[PDB]
Amino acid sequence: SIINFEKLGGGASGGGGSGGGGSIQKTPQIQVYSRHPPENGKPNILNCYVTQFHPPHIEIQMLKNGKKIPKVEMSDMSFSKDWSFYILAHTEFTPTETDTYACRVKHASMAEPKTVYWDRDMGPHSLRYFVTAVSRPGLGEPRYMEVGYVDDTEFVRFDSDAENPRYEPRARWMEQEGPEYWERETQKAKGNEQSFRVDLRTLLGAYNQSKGGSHTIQVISGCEVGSDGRLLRGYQQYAYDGCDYIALNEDLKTWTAADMAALITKHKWEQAGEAERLRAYLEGTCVEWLRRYLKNGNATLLRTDSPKAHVTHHSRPEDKVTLRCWALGFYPADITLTWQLNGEELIQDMELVETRPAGDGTFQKWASVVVPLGKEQYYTCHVYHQGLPEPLTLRWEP
Numbered sequence: 001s002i003i004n005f006e007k008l009g010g011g012a013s014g015g016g017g018s019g020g021g022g023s024i025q026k027t028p029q030i031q032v033y034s035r036h037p038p039e040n041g042k043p044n045i046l047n048c049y050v051t052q053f054h055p056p057h058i059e060i061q062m063l064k065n066g067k068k069i070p071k072v073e074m075s076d077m078s079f080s081k082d083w084s085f086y087i088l089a090h091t092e093f094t095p096t097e098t099d100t101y102a103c104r105v106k107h108a109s110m111a112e113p114k115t116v117y118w119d120r121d122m123g124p125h126s127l128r129y130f131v132t133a134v135s136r137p138g139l140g141e142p143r144y145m146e147v148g149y150v151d152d153t154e155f156v157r158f159d160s161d162a163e164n165p166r167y168e169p170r171a172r173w174m175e176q177e178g179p180e181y182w183e184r185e186t187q188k189a190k191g192n193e194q195s196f197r198v199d200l201r202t203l204l205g206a207y208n209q210s211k212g213g214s215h216t217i218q219v220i221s222g223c224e225v226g227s228d229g230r231l232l233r234g235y236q237q238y239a240y241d242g243c244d245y246i247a248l249n250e251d252l253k254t255w256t257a258a259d260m261a262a263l264i265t266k267h268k269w270e271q272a273g274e275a276e277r278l279r280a281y282l283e284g285t286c287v288e289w290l291r292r293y294l295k296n297g298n299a300t301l302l303r304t305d306s307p308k309a310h311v312t313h314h315s316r317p318e319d320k321v322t323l324r325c326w327a328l329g330f331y332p333a334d335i336t337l338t339w340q341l342n343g344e345e346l347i348q349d350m351e352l353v354e355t356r357p358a359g360d361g362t363f364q365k366w367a368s369v370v371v372p373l374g375k376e377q378y379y380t381c382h383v384y385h386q387g388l389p390e391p392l393t394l395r396w397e398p
Helices: 172-176 179-206 260-272 274-301
Strands: 029-034 044-053 059-064 085-093 101-106 114-117 125-134 143-150 153-159 216-225 231-240 243-248 255-257 308-314 322-330 336-341 350-352 363-370 379-384 392-394
Touching (some): 029 101, 029 114, 125 179, 143 179, 143 274, 153 179, 172 274, 179 260, 216 274, 231 274, 260 274, 308 392, 322 336
Antiparallel strands (some): 029 044, 143 153, 231 243, 350 363, 379 392
């Protein structure tokens, strides 16, 4: 259960521009790839994974031979520990030898839309809440969201942009909770929404910003627990427009403010004993709720799907060749791919893509090395994943 938030209630910054709020946009990173191995004439799914951007407003289109594809589904949006947002767009398609596909992204961080073409060739536990409050001048009320994670898997979500916005389960094992739980969480979410609505107005003043601009307040709140069930770390950190604003220190007693506006909040919270209130929630309430949830889904959280791996062979200019090592259909996302030349792990001639969602709950990743034509048998790829009885070692097999 997420804590009931206390207003930031600040009042003045100084427009210094250090790193705590106001606009300082992050450019999106984009990957375009098929869920399944592309085979001409066989239906598949094409993905456009967009990450690392800020602000959260973004426009994504997928194109077929330069023409917009009308039916493109969008996953719900989320954000990372570095505050940047991510989202997955995808569409059904049936690849052919000559049709080109692309994903086009429009975002305030870039002067023009970025088009990226698809190239076939190439223990402990935690209960954390990720909160987003985004003002939208000229587009209605601020959008408010609370997304909860147990061990990094989304299990609950509240999004004010529904019509009768309610807390909804996001993991099937949560359906074990009765109507009282949902009603209570929903009402608490609506109460929290109001505090953030106010805080957004307050921060406009604190940073001397226009009433016509869009702004974001984000929060990461929660507890990390040991195998013995004891608290290892508590978290209560805030960001304004993608930059650290204020955070509770590891001692759960003091705060670290990032700029002048946050100093006003630090002093308010110190005077009101906010840290004390949070320490109580983090050490008790939060942990108690984590156990409760783990009761329903620990088994699910421990499941693993081993990667299926193989090596593909690609031509390069002159005496060269690219060996690409693929890891597919694995879960969870954590994985390590390495290339070795006679015992030594390679660094310099290698290329990796960020681990990405296949769209069906599993993940994908690949690592490549450029090597001399004729020397393919001197290299081996190694795949390390918790789902495997032991690391996989593979080589290019003609």
